[PDB]
Design a binder for this molecule. Structure first.
Ligand SMILES: CCCCCCCCCCCCCCCCCC(=O)OC[C@H](COP(=O)([O-])OCC(O)COP(=O)([O-])OC[C@@H](COC(=O)CCCCCCCCCCCCCCCCC)OC(=O)CCCCCCCCCCCCCCCCC)OC(=O)CCCCCCCCCCCCCCCCC
Ligand SMILES: CCCCCCCCCCCCCCCCCC(=O)OC[C@H](COP(=O)([O-])OCC(O)COP(=O)([O-])OC[C@@H](COC(=O)CCCCCCCCCCCCCCCCC)OC(=O)CCCCCCCCCCCCCCCCC)OC(=O)CCCCCCCCCCCCCCCCC
Ligand SMILES: CCCCCCCCCCCCCCCCCC(=O)OC[C@H](COP(=O)([O-])OCC[N+](C)(C)C)OC(=O)CCCCCCCCCCCCCCCCC
Ligand SMILES: CCCCCCCCCCCCCCCCCC(=O)OC[C@H](COP(=O)([O-])OCC[N+](C)(C)C)OC(=O)CCCCCCCCCCCCCCCCC
Ligand SMILES: CCCCCCCCCCCCCCCCCC(=O)OC[C@H](COP(=O)(O)OCCN)OC(=O)CCCCCCCCCCCCCCCCC
Ligand SMILES: CCCCCCCCCCCCCCCCCC(=O)OC[C@H](COP(=O)(O)OCCN)OC(=O)CCCCCCCCCCCCCCCCC
Ligand SMILES: CCCCCCCCCCCCCCCCCC(=O)OC[C@H](COP(=O)(O)OCCN)OC(=O)CCCCCCCCCCCCCCCCC
Ligand SMILES: CCCCCCCCCCCCO[C@@H]1O[C@H](CO)[C@@H](O[C@H]2O[C@H](CO)[C@@H](O)[C@H](O)[C@H]2O)[C@H](O)[C@H]1O
Ligand code: SF4
Ligand code: SF4
Ligand code: SF4
Lengths: 155, 186, 176, 115, 144, 94, 206, 70, 318
């Protein structure tokens, strides 16, 4: 049965992708400090297989951790575009979510979803390190629900 | 569709060229096989390709225009080209060596079925081979892009937008003025 | 008063000069640094087992917003708009009118959770403890629109979290 | 034949893994993805421009010193000679001269990188 | 003392109802410590404590395998903890709801719900106010 | 706190310190998470008499700046020269 | 790899804070100061609170002033840990960052217990502080403080006498006392060159 | 706890054990239960090639004793 | 029967490398007061598999400006040469017995440098170029010292055959008579394998990712696999050189147990060292080797030429 095989193969690739998420070393402002706290010993994101890597070529997730200005917007789009696929974006904190407390500023992008597609929105100013860790686990369960090969099979 | 929905606006484009097209990109990707096979060298085919943004604007303007109901439009580009010149132009813009050679329909229809074995997206099919070599009809009775307030964008102004990524590093920076336009057909 | 962090004259007697010679050639101060990371290898790590274990919080924690009721089930909010006035981020939007009875109540009460800075000024400003920041911090969503809370969402939050919220207010209201 | 088989197997397996890596994943190629990386902003000038070498003098010296090891490698075999008086002198003579050149380049500031 | 260490390890297998239960928790929660059961909530979650563990690890929950019709044997998240145990688990208080029950209100949810984002029962925003301008309606009869 | 004797000796020796006396993980020495209720004091203005606000109104005592010169003897400095600092008796040299 | 010119292009985090503040009351503008040097949140609050108190011609009460100094020094620990460990991390010494952010994690707990927020407390306000210390908090601060000096020693055992660390830091970025003054430097950027200046000593507050 | 690192070390150790064990056993199997002959120098190769001829089965590792003298 | 032997070499190497990544993450984790991978499989045992599968189903990228042929060649060469470094290693029997096995490894190690040089150059990117030229500088720093150190040790062994090092150390480890060489050798292998505190060609905190900044997915994995395979190989080489294991011909597996333990512990020290020190500046690496190791290595080479002659302890040529 092809249906059974592709179903299992999705489980395999989905499990590999969510079990080895490598976020880009990318942070913008306050919220990057809570992201550093998620890497710190108490939460130790690395114990989930979540490893920071600097190069976009070697990254799977962009955590937009902080305010996106108009001056920084092209640069953020550049490094997102340079990520190989599949790639995911986590929007962290009010600034990245929808502009936050600089929403009405002339120099601030009102939400990073104007620039990149966003998979998970993590609320808070800043979200606690645990709130971000909850967001990463929510992304893992989203990846676990992907049906790429099942959809390919039925095309 | 016309009987089922008599007020439908039906739009009949030629081949649409653009960044994600399967037209200009299709020709440029033939380089991976060396030479470019063309039925009768592509001298017995005329295309009138149309720009994606022109088609999009035509669709948007048809939604707002009340005249577009129950009408049929033909969205064509501003110039007609022989297939040989068009494919030659593609390789000139991409700065790739162009080595055309005739291939008969039966032999080239046989290559299409070969590639049809792919369980994924076929690189080419027999149907695609026929469509590429079908001369683009002339339908004066139908309204066109100009009837929707759209100026058809010439191929020469947007090919580099599509074909720059097919160049090697040596030729990436070449500007829009380096390649001579292909011969058209008045 | 001040002190010098790095103003030393090293000893030049033979013993001190040989102790530095051994240090340079035998890497003694580098070995000492290996001992310290070795000593951490054998310590118990500080990692907790999230989500089975949670980081400690206090009753003052500022999390997800909720609109509260009186014990009778009446809304506490009276549409005074003090929370809307003080909101540093202009994240609250309110409309109000006389209810079908004579009551002063809101018809719109929105919080743009992507404008909010979770500062808690709204619950400080509220005269009737109607709007609070609750203890919930695990409400990340897949879409932006899910973070634009209207009055129905906030009343549901209060009904969902009142048991914990009331106990947290009970622990902290004498500090307020 | 054993060695050539081992070399052929090693590089074949490496080539096979590259082939899988390029033909198994789903590709999505466009201009912005494949542009050169430089921290989010477009590079200023080409990466083929000259890159100054500040250790140029050490690199040339490496050539002369690398040939010394070719001259010193046979020493374990040279120790089997009956004529041990001559080899020991010449073995020590070569090393001392290698040490002398290092001392000369060191004192003349050849090991310091240019500014 | 090494043998004493290994006996504590073996006592963990028995403390988890045999090797099957031991493997169940090891694969569900990636931890096999045995704690004192503090209580269970109506959704099946079980709450444990061990006050000789350092602050932060001295309390924990073993999530229920099924909650609200959803299979949570492998898929668990922090939003499955109901409010009464939320306070105890996050150390906002010392007293579990078994000892210090919460105040009962008619309007409080009887059935807690986890995070519903990404499902058909997710929250969708909308304006809660009614139309502000009434448009004139022309007469339904001709007269002209 | 649960480390065996041998491991305690090994890691104490490796670091050169007595680690057990100053453990970086918290145990029972920290405060209870349930505390008795406070009863906070009141400030000095909580009086029923002799408490007229006009006599304790800081804002209304602020005055507009004093004009020294408008464009309408011994030399001075902005303040006396700063006294020289002294070395710590606690530990003059780190 | 020799640097001939450094041209810092900033403004990639410019969010018009100073224009936004003009549309806020003095209370509403305070949280903007948490988000400036977002590693020294309460110190930023205090600077603003002192300025508004000075214009109001009021004085915060002694207990608030003592709480401000206490949490100002707690904040200095949070900042200096970040400053030293990320600096060490950039130079390739990654391990001390982890040891010390578990201490930083314990200090966010003090922030959260007085304000309910780990970072942007908005706790120090013109007139004093928002709320009083919860009972049992000073006991916990004392427990934390009693062990921290040992953590600093562990940091020093990794870096201070490390010949690799000294090679990377000794004689790097020398600034003369005269240049530091004219270039507008302050704080450790002045005291590193021998200048004897500290506003807590020369122009004390609270 | 630090001993949770051991399972990875043990798995790495068993992997690094296999090449050394496999080469030894394969050499015994391919050389009639003995160590593979080492021929670093031409003399040792000469003796090997003689043993290949002397064997009678074209195998340098099949050795003939006093039963092969008459 | 030789092809089976080849596979019983390559396959364990790759699996050992994969689980070295897990061990490194755990050891760094615990030395940093955290745990490291412990969710993906029990004790994080499946983490290496997830990383491997994930990387090979990730889209690979050919940069628009890169030189395609050398861009693809370089990662192939890195892994191919990494596996070739193992064929002469006696554990206790080599796959390929070589008279000059020591020299073969010097040649293959020098050739493996070009996988850094050509990957970095072929990328046509500034951070990749800077990383590549750091590889030139780092090779210039260590190779001259590295080969002369081997020569000093082999003056006691008597040949370039790797199996003879076992015989030389039947009564005693060579680390006793040559601990000054063992120290300078151990540091050299850290620079040889581009390991901290000499992790300069990738130099993450300075060059983002250095020579392999443009590599993704499978091609990136090959460089990672090659890098970790050389960590193990050069610590095995160190164990053979200085911590010789006794070989019982009738129970070779006893050798492989003791030999494996020593090589593992040496490999752990690479992780231990990475967790403990900051990074050299790459000009300071050159001056470390040329102004400290080289003067002492030259002096010790003279000493180890003379010492066998003056003590009448010259080793046999065979
Ligand atoms: C290849 C190498 C691997 C193969 C050998 C495997 C060795 C046996 C592993 C057993 C470890 C688990 C012990 C146990 O019962 O679990 C306790 C634990 C309950 O105990 P606990 O109360 O939580 O804490 C125990 C101590 O109080 C808190 O922990 P502790 O820090 O106090 O240590 C206790 C104990 C833990 O250690 C062991 O028991 C095993 C020692 C093996 C050492 C090998 C190196 O160690 C000792 O008692 C001291 C002697 C141990 C040797 C110390 C040598 C140090 C190295 C020398 C210093 C210089 C280094 C350079 O139960 C478990 O969780 C079991 C989980 C399974 C762990 C994995 C075990 C299998 C490892 C892989 C096997 C091969 C595949
Ligand atoms: C195992 C071998 C691994 C390397 C395999 C190389 C092919 C990689 C696949 C590939 O080339 O990408 C697609 C590539 C086409 O990509 P493209 O960007 O559209 O075309 C760019 C140009 O071809 C321009 O591409 P290009 O810049 O890479 O130039 C091609 C080639 C230049 O090649 C030539 O111009 C003529 C052939 C000379 C190379 C032959 C040896 C040269 C002298 C050494 C003698 C060696 C004898 C042994 O460049 C080389 O020098 C490669 C030398 C490799 C030597 C391997 C060691 C022997 O090739 C094809 O698919 C056809
Ligand atoms: C090539 C061979 C590699 C096969 C490895 C398969 C991984 C096994 C696995 O999924 O781990 C258990 C996982 C564990 O489930 P999990 O990843 O959802 O656990 C979530 C995390 N905890 C448990 C801590 C809350 O099982 C699965 O997720 C099902 C996927 C099976 C993979 C498809 C096999 C075909
Ligand atoms: C150290 C060595 C480790 C090597 C590990 C090698 C990998 C081992 C694990 C293999 C698992 C199976 C691999 C399937 C991955 C296919 C990639 C993919 O998801 O593409 C989805 C694609 C999706 O196809 P699609 O046609 O539905 O949509 C893609 C087209 N666009 C972009 C327009 C939407 O499916 C396939 O390509 C075919 C899947 C067939 C499975 C074989
Ligand atoms: C009877 C006759 C006998 C004749 C022979 C007698 C001679 C015996 C004594 C000779 C001296 C023995 C030591 C020689 C080894 C080389 C020593 C050396 O050069 O170290 C100094 C070097 C320079 O550093 P620095 O201090 O900054 O500069 C000095 C002034 N310019 O600094 C360094 O090299 C530091 C290197 C930094 C990186 C270190 C990272 C790893 C540290 C832990 C390694 C532990 C060693 C384990 C070895 C394993 C063995 C297999
Ligand atoms: C730029 C892109 C490069 C990409 C990398 C490509 C792979 C390169 C691999 C390295 C090439 C150099 C190979 C050198 C091998 C030398 C090894 C050696 O000398 O020993 C092997 C053996 C001699 O054994 P020995 O003990 O010395 O004497 C015989 C006693 N029985 O002698 C033999 O076993 C016979 C071997 C003969 C075949 C030699 C073929 C060399 C091909 C070069 C390519
Ligand atoms: C400051 C620390 C710096 C760290 C730098 C890294 C250095 C790590 C060195 C790791 C290797 C240490 C040695 C480990 C000993 C392994 C013990 C073993 O498994 O075998 C037992 C062995 C004795 O057996 P054997 O070596 O065969 O006898 C010698 C005759 N040739 O051994 C007998 O006891
Ligand atoms: C036969 C084998 C053993 C022989 C050793 C061969 C190597 C000899 C090394 C050169 C010795 C003399 O050459 C060298 O000259 C310079 C003067 O610029 C000396 O001094 C200079 O260099 C050293 C180190 O760089 C600096 O700390 C010092 O500030 C500077 O004055 C060196 O200390 C000395 O080493
Ligand atoms: S969301 Fe809050 S904490 Fe995060 S960057 Fe913006 S202001 Fe700072
Ligand atoms: S917490 Fe602050 S920003 Fe959020 S709604 Fe309340 S007052 Fe506004
Ligand atoms: S929530 Fe409170 S402050 Fe806001 S309008 Fe209602 S009663 Fe007023």
């Amino acid at each position: 049965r092809g249906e059974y095989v592709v179903a299992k193969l999705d489980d395999l690739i989905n499990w590999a992708r969510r079990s080895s998420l490598w976020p880009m070393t990318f942070g913008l402002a306050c919220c990057a400090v809570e992201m550093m706290h998620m890497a710190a010993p108490r939460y130790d994101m690395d114990r989930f297989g979540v490893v920071f890597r600097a190069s976009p070529r070697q990254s799977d997730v962009m955590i937009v951790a902080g305010t996106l200005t108009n001056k920084m917007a092209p640069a953020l789009r550049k490094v997102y575009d340079q990520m190989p696929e599949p790639r995911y974006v986590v929007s962290m904190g009010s600034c990245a979510n929808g502009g936050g407390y600089y929403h009405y500023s002339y120099s601030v992008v009102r939400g990073c979803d104007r620039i990149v597609p966003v998979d998970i929105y993590v609320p808070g100013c800043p979200p606690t390190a645990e709130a971000l860790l909850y967001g990463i686990l929510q992304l893992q369960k989203k990846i676990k629900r992907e049906k790429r090969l099942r959809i390919w099979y039925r095309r | 569709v016309r009987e089922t929905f008599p007020e439908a606006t039906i739009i009949k484009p030629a081949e649409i060229f653009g960044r994600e097209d399967r037209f200009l990109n299709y020709f440029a990707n033939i380089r991976w096989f060396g030479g470019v096979p063309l039925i009768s060298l592509g001298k017995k085919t005329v295309k009138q390709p149309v720009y994606i943004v022109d088609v999009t604007k035509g669709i948007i303007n048809a939604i707002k225009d009340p005249d577009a109901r129950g009408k049929t439009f033909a969205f064509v580009g501003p110039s007609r080209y022989l297939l040989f010149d068009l494919v030659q132009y593609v390789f000139a813009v991409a700065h790739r060596p162009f080595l055309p050679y005739p291939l008969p329909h039966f032999a080239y229809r046989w290559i299409g079925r070969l590639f049809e074995i792919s369980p994924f997206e076929p690189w080419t099919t027999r149907d695609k081979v026929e469509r590429i070599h079908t001369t683009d009809k002339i339908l004066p009775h139908l309204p066109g892009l100009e009837d929707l307030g759209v100026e058809a964008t010439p191929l020469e102004l947007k090919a580099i937008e599509v074909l720059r990524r097919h160049r090697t590093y040596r030729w990436l920076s070449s500007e829009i003025e380096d390649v001579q336009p292909a011969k058209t057909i008045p | 008063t001040y002190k010098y962090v790095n103003l030393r004259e090293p000893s030049m007697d033979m013993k001190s000069v040989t102790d530095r010679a051994a240090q340079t050639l035998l890497w003694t101060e580098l070995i000492r640094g290996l001992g310290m990371t070795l000593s951490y290898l054998f310590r118990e790590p500080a990692t907790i087992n999230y989500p089975f274990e949670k980081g400690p919080l206090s009753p003052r924690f500022r999390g997800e917003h909720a609109l509260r009721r009186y014990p009778s089930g009446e809304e506490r909010c009276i549409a005074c708009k003090l929370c809307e006035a003080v909101c540093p981020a202009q994240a609250i939007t309110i409309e109000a009118e006389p209810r079908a009875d004579g009551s002063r109540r809101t018809t719109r009460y929105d919080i743009d959770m992507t404008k909010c800075i979770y500062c808690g000024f709204c619950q400080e400003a509220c005269p009737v403890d109607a709007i609070v920041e609750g203890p919930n911090f695990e409400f990340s969503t897949e879409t932006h629109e899910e973070l634009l809370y209207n009055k129905e969402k906030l009343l549901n939050n209060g009904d969902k979290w009142e048991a914990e919220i009331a106990a947290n207010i009970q622990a902290d209201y004498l500090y307020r | 034949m054993n060695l050539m088989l081992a070399l052929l197997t090693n590089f074949t397996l490496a080539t096979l893994l590259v082939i899988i890596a390029f033909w198994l994943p789903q590709l999505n190629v466009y201009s912005e993805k494949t542009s050169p990386y430089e921290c989010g902003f477009d590079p200023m000038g080409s990466a083929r421009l000259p890159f100054s070498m500040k250790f140029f003098l050490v690199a040339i010296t490496f050539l002369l010193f690398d040939l010394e090891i070719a001259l010193l490698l046979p020493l374990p075999w040279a120790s089997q000679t009956a004529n041990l008086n001559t080899m020991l002198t010449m073995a020590l003579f070569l090393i001392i001269l290698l040490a002398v050149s290092l001392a000369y380049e060191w004192t003349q500031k050849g090991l310091e990188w240019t500014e | 003392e090494l043998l004493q260490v290994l006996k504590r390890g073996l006592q963990q297998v028995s403390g988890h109802g045999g090797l099957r239960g031991y493997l169940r928790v090891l694969f569900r929660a990636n931890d096999v410590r045995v704690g004192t059961l503090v209580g269970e909530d109506k959704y099946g979650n079980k709450y444990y404590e061990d006050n000789k563990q350092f602050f932060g690890r001295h309390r924990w929950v073993i999530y229920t395998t099924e909650m609200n019709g959803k299979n949570t044997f492998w898929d668990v998240d922090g939003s499955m903890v109901p409010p009464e145990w939320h306070r105890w688990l996050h150390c906002m208080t010392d007293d579990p709801p078994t000892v210090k029950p919460p105040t009962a209100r008619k309007f409080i949810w009887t059935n807690h719900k986890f995070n519903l984002s990404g499902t058909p029962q997710q929250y969708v925003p909308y304006s809660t106010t009614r139309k502000k301008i009434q448009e004139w309606v022309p007469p339904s009869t001709p007269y002209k | 706190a649960s480390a065996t004797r041998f491991i305690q000796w090994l890691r104490n020796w490796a670091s050169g310190r007595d680690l057990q006396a100053k453990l970086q993980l918290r145990y029972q020495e920290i405060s209870k998470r349930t505390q008795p209720p406070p009863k906070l004091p009141v400030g000095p203005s909580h009086k029923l008499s002799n408490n007229y606000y006009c006599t304790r109104d800081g804002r209304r005592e602020a005055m507009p700046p004093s004009i020294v010169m408008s464009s309408q003897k011994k030399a001075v400095s902005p303040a006396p020269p700063i006294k020289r600092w002294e070395l710590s008796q606690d530990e003059p040299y780190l | 790899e020799m640097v001939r010119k450094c041209d810092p292009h900033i403004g990639l985090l410019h969010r018009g804070t100073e224009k936004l503040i003009e549309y806020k009351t003095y209370l509403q503008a305070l949280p903007y100061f948490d988000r400036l040097d977002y590693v020294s949140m309460m110190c930023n609050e205090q600077a603003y609170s002192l300025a508004v108190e000075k214009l109001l011609n009021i004085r915060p009460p002694p207990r608030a002033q003592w709480i401000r100094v206490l949490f100002g020094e707690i904040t200095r620990l949070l900042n200096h840990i970040m400053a030293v460990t990320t600096h060490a991390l950039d130079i390739g010494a990654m391990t001390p960052f982890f040891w010390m952010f578990e201490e930083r994690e314990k200090m966010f707990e003090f922030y959260e217990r007085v304000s309910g927020a780990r970072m942007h407390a908005a706790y120090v306000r013109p007139g004093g502080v928002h709320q009083d210390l919860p009972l049992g908090l000073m006991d916990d601060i004392y427990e934390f403080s009693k062990n921290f000096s040992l953590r600093i020693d562990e940091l020093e055992e990794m870096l201070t006498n490390n010949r690799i660390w000294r090679n990377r830091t000794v004689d790097i970025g020398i600034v003369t006392a005269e240049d530091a003054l004219n270039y507008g430097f302050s704080g450790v950027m002045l005291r590193g060159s021998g200048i004897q200046w500290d506003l807590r000593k020369t122009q004390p507050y609270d | 706890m630090w001993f949770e690192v051991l399972p990875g070390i043990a798995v790495m150790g068993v992997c690094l054990f296999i090449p050394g064990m496999a080469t030894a056993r394969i050499h015994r199997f391919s050389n009639g239960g003995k160590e593979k002959r080492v021929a670093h120098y031409p003399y040792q190769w000469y003796l090997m090639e003689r043993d290949r001829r002397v064997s009678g089965v074209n195998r340098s590792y099949v050795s003939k004793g006093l039963e092969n003298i008459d | 029967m030789f092809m089976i032997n080849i596979l019983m070499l390559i396959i364990p190497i790759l699996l050992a490398v994969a689980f070295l990544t897990l061990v490194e993450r755990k050891v760094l984790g615990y030395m940093q007061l955290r745990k490291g991978p412990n969710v993906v499989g029990p004790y994080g045992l499946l983490q290496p598999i997830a990383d491997a599968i994930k990387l090979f189903i990730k889209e690979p990228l050919r940069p628009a400006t890169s030189s395609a042929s050398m861009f693809i060649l370089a990662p192939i060469m890195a892994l191919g040469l990494a596996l070739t470094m193992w064929i002469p290693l006696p554990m206790p029997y080599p796959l390929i017995n070589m008279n000059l096995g020591v020299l073969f490894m010097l040649a293959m190690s020098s050739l493996a440098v070009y996988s850094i040089l050509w990957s970095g150059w072929a990328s046509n990117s500034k951070y990749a170029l800077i990383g590549a030229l750091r590889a030139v500088a780092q090779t210039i720093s260590y190779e001259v010292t590295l080969a002369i150190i081997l020569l000093s040790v082999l003056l006691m062994s008597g040949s370039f055959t790797l199996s003879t090092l076992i015989t030389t150390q039947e009564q005693m480890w060579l680390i006793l008579p040559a601990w000054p060489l063992a120290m300078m050798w151990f540091i050299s292998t850290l620079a040889e394998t581009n390991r901290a505190p000499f992790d300069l060609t990738e130099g993450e905190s300075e060059l983002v990712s250095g020579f392999n900044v443009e590599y993704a997915a499978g091609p990136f994995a090959l460089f990672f696999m090659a890098e970790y395979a050389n960590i193990i190989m050069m610590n095995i080489f160190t164990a053979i050189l200085f911590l010789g294991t006794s070989h019982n011909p009738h129970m070779p597996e006893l050798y492989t147990i003791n030999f494996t333990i020593k090589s593992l512990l040496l490999t752990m020290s690479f992780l231990w060292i990475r967790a403990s020190y900051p990074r050299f500046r790459y000009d300071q690496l050159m001056h470390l080797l040329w102004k400290n190791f080289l003067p002492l290595t030259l002096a010790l080479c003279m000493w180890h030429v003379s010492l066998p002659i003056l003590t009448s302890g010259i080793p046999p040529q065979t």
